[PDB]
């Protein structure tokens, strides 16, 4: 009985891929917002005040 | 009213008897839906070939027919656009609705317009294929033959040329002669999916249709194209394919008692195709001011260009695009043989910017092929060996193209100029690099507020070397450099990439904010 | 309500529905090899010589959504497919036209009409009665009101001047129903499987009538989008067969087309659970009898409808076999809503019969002496195979190429319609490689990204590249010796050899020749095996182990067993 | 008129088939780039919509498969105001936020 059962490949691929797309998009948007704030902080001070 | 009686029905032809003034290709009506055309006639009878078929109409000896006394004329209806029709006008698949008012009626064998009604071919026709648009140009009013073996991509090339007119105001007419209905429905679906359905018509005569319909389908398509040309419109016609049309004509003539000639074809097979393909060209403002571009398709057998019909068709058109089976087997798509392909119009059919950009590329390609086939010993001449082995491979990488992928004319020209200025030396067979470059240039030239004006300048006028260098250095190169350095890791250490892109202005700060605002991957100033 | 749900099912329907019964793994572990093999043979998965592998195959088949759908529906009251646009039978008429033969010749007879209630139509059938036997003559040309020309559909013996003939002004018709399965007939419906000629119960349909309200209806079709699974490694991996399209089987004589045809019939009937129509055109009597007998023996006879236009019959009768088969397939799709796999053999003989009929009726021959209507007739035959809301009609047609001349007009006409071409090689067969399919020459339009995955395309491309490269390098090996290769070239050659031999497969029908049991390999198993071989994982195994196996694990197990025996022997 | 120049920039896409749709009507607070997931054949676009009449923030995903659908999806930017009709897709059962397909849409920028 034990040797017969095995891990499927269709549902696993679909679910894994969907979670990877969501995690990738979330990570990219976080990195974009941090990069832009770093650019803003690089050129944001008055010369004379 | 009826004035003819059917006497015999043999050889798929009908033998009408009656006293009438018959004329060649005069419509004879057997019902309100079924009609034929007169092929041969004498002072008491005629031989008619049917164009239709009706299930409830049972034609037989003794049936009555009416000789309308008018030549075969195709009527023009408003709902032709975005529709599949047959040679008599009936809409087999339609997207809009008809009004039952004929805009015009065009005679199918309309004689070609004389010499004084013509004009020079000087305006490009965009086919969406970089190799064709740069090395084998097609002008508005040209006749270019697509010739090759089976399953090599001739129909794909024609459909690609017909997709590039999405935003050019060029009407599309696609004539299918003995094609499968599955493929025609698929082509209709592709037209709808690629936003050119409202601009296109499909004339269809299936492989099991009446022989007269398959014979006269290209002429009906040309009559519709002539209607559209008479109101100053540029029409692009594709015939798929003319070998089936030659077979249909041979079958019709053999079944009518005409003697066979060379290869069993009738004696006037050359005239049938020449008087058909001579109706295309560019016409003067007083005679319509439009143009008709024809892309007939021909099938060879195992590369045999020397066949009867293929050599008849080569001696009529203004050049040919030859598709090779060896390249198709090797995986090259589109499999177009540059060595055996010609465009007699040449740079006359290219815009000034494209003529400047693609000048002397065929020579370099032939030199690269000559070197590749004859490298022989490992001894190397000079750095020029590396120069050729670099630029030829860059050109070959530029050749490849996905199916149904439309590459704009200016994008192709800019790619050619980048290749000639050595801005593709870093390439090491990474398709995503050219995909990124093409997408960036396309979006910049289509949507950017200043890129749109740059594209208009490139289309209309002919710029010189210094202005092009300024354009490339101050706008195009910073955008390309940023969008390449943020997708290709190996470009960080690629010695050629730094050697060429070191002095280019960095523009990451602005393109970042453009990305974060949801802008496309080519906007550099703003949306117009 | 078991009684109510079983009340809507006939006993034969319950017998069939016993196949789609779900077995738990706890039960399945308790079966024996014999019961597991019986289950696999009943479900078309082929014999298995291992226990756990057999359970895994049965579970994979059972876990499929289609199998579960059928099993769930089998416990519900019968739902009837409501036929939209059915085939309407012919109308009931009387014999309205009468006449007699006035001119005789070889295969062509002229009929003069005396008493007619209505004017004669083209392609109608005249019946003659000679010595209690009925002869059908199809009308070709109507010269005038009372004079037509006809050609025989069958045998012309017994016809003479003055033989009275009568006609209903209708084309030839055949009796079609579900009872046609398991029977062997000819294109005009004569019984061919017994001497007493037990009739076929059904309605009379005219195969030459398409019954379309308008031409636009012929454009309501669905372009092919699905791939049929055959269980053959080479076909599945490299030459996917469209569902609703056309596949040509090309080659010379003796390459092995008929064995492939029988295997595909069996696989479609058992594994895919469908209805098969065979249409033999110019079918040899010995081959027809043999195929009928093996259909009875192998158990796919009761779900196959055979039409045989024999080689010895008149060309007019041989021409109608394809049309009759197409009509049977159209009935089985439109009236019953069942997917049909239609088999045609041989297309070249259909073209030849058309050419013969054209030449007999005094028509001017076309190039190479063929009929002027060659492409038109080929289109007429092939355009009725399609895919509609009611179901799919898949066609697998065998062709004979004379002297390997692929530019022959018959072949050029045939390639205009084929959606996938499978080309067999006599050299490859002579090397003992079966099914002897040439992977480099053959190609399929369905091996794209529109229908297959990225992995399948990558595997197919790498396989074709490796096979071409090893074919190139074999000549160098033969001439200069295996040492002259480089280090990478030796590995490429070994991988290519193992790939080429792994593509061979034993069929469940070919047990007569070699005596080896057949196998059924799923697409995933073939992909995994080819992926294992491409990486060079099995490069330590002799090539002789890769021949005529089912899956990648069999080679490994056999090599391990041989190594164990060698270690024990010393 | 403030909205006079917005009229010339209207872009309307529609299907002649009518299914059950979820209607969104509001401004696009944030929209990301596009991702290709199903064998590089589809386009995935995450959208943040501030609705009209409630001014609440909702998160959705949009799927594009054809050339015309991708062209319509590329017209959506930040601060774009949309009247979008979206057919629910059965892949949301494995997603945090629903996945939709554009049936009808009107885009102004
Ligand atoms: N650029 C391309 N990239 C990939 N596949 C392509 C490309 N162009 C064409 N194809 C494929 O090549 C095959 C042949 O294309 P097509 O049908 O246009 O050729 P053809 O010469 O008209 O053939 P036929 O003999 O069937 O009329 C098709 O499967 C098509 O999808
Ligand atoms: N898979 C196979 N295994 C073994 N022999 C085969 C196979 N396929 C074909 N053959 C051989 O082909 C012969 C019959 O040829 P046939 O199938 O009629 O080819 P064709 O119809 O192409 O002429 C048989 O004697 C048989 O040995
Ligand atoms: Mg084609
Ligand atoms: Mg055979």
């Amino acid at each position: 009985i034990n040797q017969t059962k095995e891990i499927d490949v269709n549902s696993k691929i679909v679910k894994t891929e969907l979670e990877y797309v969501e995690e990738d998009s979330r990570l990219r948007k976080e990195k974009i917002e941090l990069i832009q704030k770093n650019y803003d902080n690089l050129n944001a001070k008055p010369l004379v005040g | 009213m009826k004035n003819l009686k059917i006497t015999a029905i043999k050889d798929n032809l009908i033998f009408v008897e009656g006293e009438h003034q018959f004329s060649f290709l005069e419509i004879i009506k057997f019902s309100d839906k079924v009609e034929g055309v007169v092929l041969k006639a004498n002072d008491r009878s005629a031989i008619v070939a049917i164009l239709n078929e009706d299930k409830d109409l049972n034609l037989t000896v003794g049936s009555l027919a009416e000789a309308t006394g008018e030549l075969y004329k195709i009527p023009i209806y408003d709902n032709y656009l975005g529709s599949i029709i047959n040679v008599l006008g009936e809409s087999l698949v339609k997207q809009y609705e008809r009004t039952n008012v004929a805009l015009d009626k065009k005679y199918v064998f309309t004689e070609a317009q004389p010499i004084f009604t013509r004009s020079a071919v000087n305006e490009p026709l965009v086919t969406g294929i970089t190799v064709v648009d740069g090395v084998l140009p097609v002008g508005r009013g040209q006749k270019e033959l697509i010739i090759g073996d089976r399953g090599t991509g001739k129909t794909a090339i024609a459909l690609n040329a017909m997709l590039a007119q999405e935003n050019t105001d060029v009407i599309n007419i696609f004539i299918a002669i003995g094609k499968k209905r599955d493929e025609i429905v698929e082509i209709y679906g592709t037209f709808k999916k690629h936003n050119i359905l409202h601009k296109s018509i499909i004339v269809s005569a299936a492989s099991d249709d009446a022989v007269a319909a398959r014979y006269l389908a290209p002429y009906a398509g040309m009559a519709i194209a002539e209607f559209f040309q008479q109101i100053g419109k540029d029409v692009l016609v594709v015939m798929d394919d003319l070998t089936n049309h030659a077979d249909a004509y041979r079958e019709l003539s053999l079944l009518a008692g005409i003697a066979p000639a060379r290869e069993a074809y009738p004696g006037d097979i050359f005239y049938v195709h020449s008087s058909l393909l001579e109706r295309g060209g560019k016409y003067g403002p007083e005679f319509g001011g439009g143009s008709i571009t024809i892309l007939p398709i021909a099938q060879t057998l195992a590369g045999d260009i020397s066949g009867y019909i293929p050599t008849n068709l080569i001696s009529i058109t203004d050049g040919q695009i030859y598709t090779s089976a060896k390249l198709f087997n090797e995986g090259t798509r589109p499999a177009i043989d540059v060595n055996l392909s010609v465009s007699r119009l040449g740079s006359a059919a290219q815009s000034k910017f494209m003529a400047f950009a693609s000048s002397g590329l065929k020579k370099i390609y032939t030199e690269y092929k000559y070197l590749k086939r004859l490298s022989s010993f490992s001894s190397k001449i000079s750095n020029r060996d590396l120069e050729t082995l670099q630029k030829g491979k860059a050109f070959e990488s530029l050749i490849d193209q996905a199916e149904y992928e439309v590459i704009d004319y200016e994008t192709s020209a800019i790619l050619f100029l980048l290749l000639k200025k050595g801005f593709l030396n870093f390439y090491t067979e990474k398709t995503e690099a050219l995909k990124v470059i093409i997408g960036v240039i396309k979006v910049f030239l289509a949507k950017d507020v200043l890129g749109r004006k740059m594209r208009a300048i490139l289309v209309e006028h002919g710029i010189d070397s210094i202005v092009w260098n300024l354009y490339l250095n101050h706008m195009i190169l910073p955008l390309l450099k940023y969008h390449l350095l943020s997708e290709l890791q190996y470009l960080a250490t690629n010695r050629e990439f730094i050697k060429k892109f070191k002095d280019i202005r960095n523009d990451g700060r602005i393109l970042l904010a453009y990305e974060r605002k949801g802008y496309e991957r080519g906007i550099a100033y703003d949306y117009k | 309500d078991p009684e109510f749900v079983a009340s809507t099912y006939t006993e034969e329907e319950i017998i069939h529905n016993l196949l789609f019964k779900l077995y738990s793994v706890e039960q399945l572990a308790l079966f024996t090899i014999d019961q597991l093999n019986a289950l696999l043979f009943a479900r078309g998965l082929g014999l298995e010589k291992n226990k756990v592998r057999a359970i895994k195959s049965l579970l994979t088949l059972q876990t499929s959504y289609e199998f579960m759908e059928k099993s769930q529906a089998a416990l519900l009251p019968k739902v009837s497919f409501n036929p939209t646009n059915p085939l309407k039978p012919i109308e009931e008429k009387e014999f309205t036209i009468f006449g007699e033969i006035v001119e005789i010749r070889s295969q062509v007879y002229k009929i003069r009409i005396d008493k007619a209630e209505e004017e004669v139509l083209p392609k109608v059938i005249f019946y003659a009665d000679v010595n209690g036997k009925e002869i059908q003559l199809e009308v070709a040309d109507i010269f005038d009101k009372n004079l037509v020309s006809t050609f025989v559909l069958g045998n012309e013996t017994g016809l003479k001047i003055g033989t009275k003939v009568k006609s209903k002004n209708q084309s030839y018709a055949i009796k079609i129903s579900k009872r046609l399965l398991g029977r062997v007939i000819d294109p005009i419906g004569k019984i061919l499987d017994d001497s007493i000629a037990t009739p076929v119960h059904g309605n009379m349909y005219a195969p030459l009538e398409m019954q379309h309200d308008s031409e636009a209806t012929r454009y309501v079709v669905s372009p092919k989008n699905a791939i049929l699974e055959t269980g053959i490694k080479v076909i599945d991996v490299l030459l996917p067969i469209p569902k609703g399209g056309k596949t040509g089987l090309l080659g010379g004589a003796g390459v092995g087309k008929t064995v492939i045809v029988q295997e595909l019939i069996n696989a479609f009937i058992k594994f895919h659970d469908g209805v098969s129509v065979f249409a033999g055109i110019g079918e040899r009597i010995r081959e027809g009898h043999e195929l009928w007998k093996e259909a009875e023996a192998l158990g796919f006879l009761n779900k196959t409808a055979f039409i045989f236009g024999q080689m010895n019959e008149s060309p007019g009768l041989r021409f109608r076999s394809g049309i009759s088969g197409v009509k049977v397939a159209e009935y089985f799709r439109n009236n019953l809503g069942k997917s049909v796999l239609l088999f045609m053999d041989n297309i070249f003989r259909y073209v030849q019969a058309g050419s013969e009929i054209s030449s007999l009726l005094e028509k001017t021959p076309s190039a190479v002496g063929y009929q002027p209507t060659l492409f038109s007739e080929m289109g007429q035959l092939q355009e009725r195979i399609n895919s509609t809301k009611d179901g799919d009609i898949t066609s697998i047609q065998a062709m004979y190429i004379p002297a390997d001349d692929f530019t022959d007009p018959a072949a050029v006409a045939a390639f205009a319609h084929f959606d996938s071409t499978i080309i067999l090689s006599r050299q490859l067969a002579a090397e003992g490689v079966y099914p002897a399919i040439d992977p480099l020459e053959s190609n399929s339009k369905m091996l794209s990204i529109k229908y297959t995955s990225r992995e399948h395309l990558d595997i197919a491309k790498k396989t074709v590249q490796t096979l071409e490269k090893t074919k190139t390098l074999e000549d160098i090996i033969n001439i200069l010796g295996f040492d002259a290769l480089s280090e990478d070239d030796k590995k490429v050659v070994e991988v290519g050899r193992r790939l080429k031999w792994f593509l061979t497969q034993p069929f469940v029908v070919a047990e007569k020749f070699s005596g080896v049991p057949g196998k059924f390999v799923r697409l995933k198993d073939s992909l995994k095996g080819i992926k294992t071989i491409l990486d060079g994982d099995l490069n330590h195994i002799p090539v002789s182990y890769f021949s005529f196996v089912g899956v990648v694990e069999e080679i490994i197990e056999k090599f391990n067993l041989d190594a164990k025996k060698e270690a024990l022997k010393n | 008129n403030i909205f006079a120049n917005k009229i010339a920039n209207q872009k309307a896409y529609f299907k002649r088939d009518i299914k059950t749709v979820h209607t969104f009507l509001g401004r696009v607070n944030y929209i990301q780039r596009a991702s290709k997931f199903n064998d590089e054949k589809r386009v995935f676009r995450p959208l943040q919509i501030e609705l009209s009449g409630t001014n609440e923030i909702v998160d959705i995903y949009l799927e594009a498969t054809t050339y015309i659908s991708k062209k319509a999806l590329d017209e959506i930017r930040q601060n774009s105001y949309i009247f979008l009709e979206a057919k629910w897709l059965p892949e949301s059962n494995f997603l945090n936020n629903p996945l939709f397909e554009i049936q009808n849409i009107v885009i102004e920028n």
Side-chain angles (χ1 to χ4, degrees), chain C residues 250-260 284 286-287 290 345-346 349 398-400 424 433-436 505-507 510-511 513-514 548:
Chain C
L250 273 78
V255 291
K257 297 193 276 296
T258 308
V259 183
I260 317 291
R284 318 192 169 85
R286 184 199 82 72
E287 290 186 338
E290 179 204 52
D345 183 8
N346 198 286
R349 320 207 198 104
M399 210 171 171
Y400 161 75
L424 285 89
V433 177
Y434 287 110
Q505 189 186 314
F507 295 147
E511 304 218 31
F513 320 124
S514 63
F548 291 101

Side-chain angles (χ1 to χ4, degrees), chain B residues 149-157 179 183 240-241 297 299 323 328 333-334 401-404, chain C residues 415-416 444-445 448 450:
Chain B
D149 290 356
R150 65 180 171 85
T152 308
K154 320 182 282 288
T155 313
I157 289 164
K179 300 289 94 175
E183 184 178 2
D240 198 318
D241 63 7
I297 288 184
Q299 177 184 105
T323 75
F328 207 83
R333 272 84 174 277
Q401 179 166 350
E403 190 181 5
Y404 299 141
Chain C
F415 290 107
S444 184
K445 285 201 182 307
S448 300
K450 209 167 314 172

Side-chain angles (χ1 to χ4, degrees), chain B residues 109-115 117-118 226 274-280 283:
Chain B
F109 284 178
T110 308
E111 196 188 12
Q113 269 185 311
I115 284 167
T117 77
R118 310 273 173 150
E226 281 168 349
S274 80
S275 82
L276 172 66
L277 294 182
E278 278 317 304
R279 270 143 85 169
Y283 304 92

Side-chain angles (χ1 to χ4, degrees), chain C residues 109-292:
Chain C
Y109 297 83
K110 263 186 67 158
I111 286 163
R112 190 261 314 283
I113 294 154
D114 304 316
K115 196 179 180 181
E117 287 179 353
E118 65 183 1
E119 309 306 278
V120 58
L121 279 163
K123 294 180 178 66
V124 304
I125 290 287
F126 273 83
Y127 303 88
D129 198 75
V130 297
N131 314 108
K133 213 197 94 180
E134 204 201 49
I135 309 194
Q136 308 193 10
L137 309 163
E138 189 154 89
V139 169
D141 291 332
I142 315 174
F143 296 125
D144 69 354
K145 172 141 82 182
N146 310 120
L147 195 60
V148 305
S149 193
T150 62
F151 56 94
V152 193
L153 296 198
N155 201 358
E156 62 162 351
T157 306
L159 289 167
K160 64 188 60 159
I161 298 287
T163 297
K164 303 272 172 264
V165 290
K166 59 175 70 179
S167 166
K168 293 174 181 271
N169 221 43
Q170 284 175 310
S171 57
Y172 87 107
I174 56 171
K175 291 187 286 184
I176 314 173
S177 75
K178 186 175 172 66
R179 321 285 311 282
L180 212 44
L181 304 170
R183 311 297 316 282
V184 182
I185 67 164
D186 63 358
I188 50 171
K190 170 189 162 184
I191 307 298
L192 293 176
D193 45 23
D194 60 28
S195 63
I196 58 182
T198 55
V200 177
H201 290 345
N203 291 114
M204 289 211 90
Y205 303 90
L208 275 181
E209 296 280 302
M210 290 175 287
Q211 309 214 322
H212 279 104
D213 60 357
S214 86
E215 161 82 355
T217 313
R218 304 209 59 184
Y219 282 80
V220 185
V221 301
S222 63
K224 58 194 201 313
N225 55 81
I227 283 161
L228 193 83
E229 174 147 23
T230 60
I232 304 172
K233 281 176 272 178
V234 61
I235 299 188
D236 284 345
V237 172
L238 302 161
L239 315 165
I241 284 184
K243 202 188 279 194
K246 283 157 266 275
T247 285
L249 266 181
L250 273 78
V255 291
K257 297 193 276 296
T258 308
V259 183
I260 317 291
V261 167
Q262 294 191 37
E263 172 82 9
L264 294 165
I265 292 182
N266 179 32
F268 190 82
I269 292 171
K270 298 260 178 60
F271 177 88
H272 275 269
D273 186 74
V275 167
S276 190
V277 176
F278 190 97
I281 313 156
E283 176 85 339
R284 318 192 169 85
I285 294 191
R286 184 199 82 72
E287 290 186 338
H289 164 99
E290 179 204 52
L291 190 149
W292 173 48

Side-chain angles (χ1 to χ4, degrees), chain B residues 301-316:
Chain B
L301 299 171
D304 188 26
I305 288 170
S306 303
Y308 191 23
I309 306 300
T311 43
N312 263 347
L313 286 171
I314 292 170
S315 69
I316 291 167

